[PDB]
Subunit: 97 residues, 2 copies
Amino acid sequence: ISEENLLEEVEKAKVIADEAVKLQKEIDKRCQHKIAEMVALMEKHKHQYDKIIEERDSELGLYKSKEQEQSSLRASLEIELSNLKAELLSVKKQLEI
Amino acid sequence: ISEENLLEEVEKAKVIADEAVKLQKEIDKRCQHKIAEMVALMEKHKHQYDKIIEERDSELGLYKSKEQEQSSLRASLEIELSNLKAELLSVKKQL
């Protein structure tokens, strides 16, 4: 209706647009900063894991070497004691006859 | 001592060795399997993360062009509201 009413309504829309612009920046700024912090944390973790995972071939190589030796030891103890039993069971058979 | 004594002693040593060996090997292997489990979990996590982080350049891409569209629209809105104001002020001067 009034001319002065149109002008007031424009002026207010203009102040409200400006506040909305300002507050939306602040929201989006905070949200993107959170996203960056989480990305960064994920990345730092991903890297720690990756180092662990890369080191495994060489750790497992060295384990495999000790394990082979231990398997030979276990086997030999077993064979030795199995052989001692055989030998004494044979001497108890010569003697019992 | 007796030969029978020796035999019985050997047989005790044998069955004990056999079983000690068996348990040591179970313990040794369980420990390896436990390590592998943890590693496999870390890798799955690591790949989940890589997927999130490597679609980031793309997500930033579309974000960017959407943010430029919104800011362009907003700059034109502000030009128009400011032309509306000047013009109504003009008519306001003319009473």
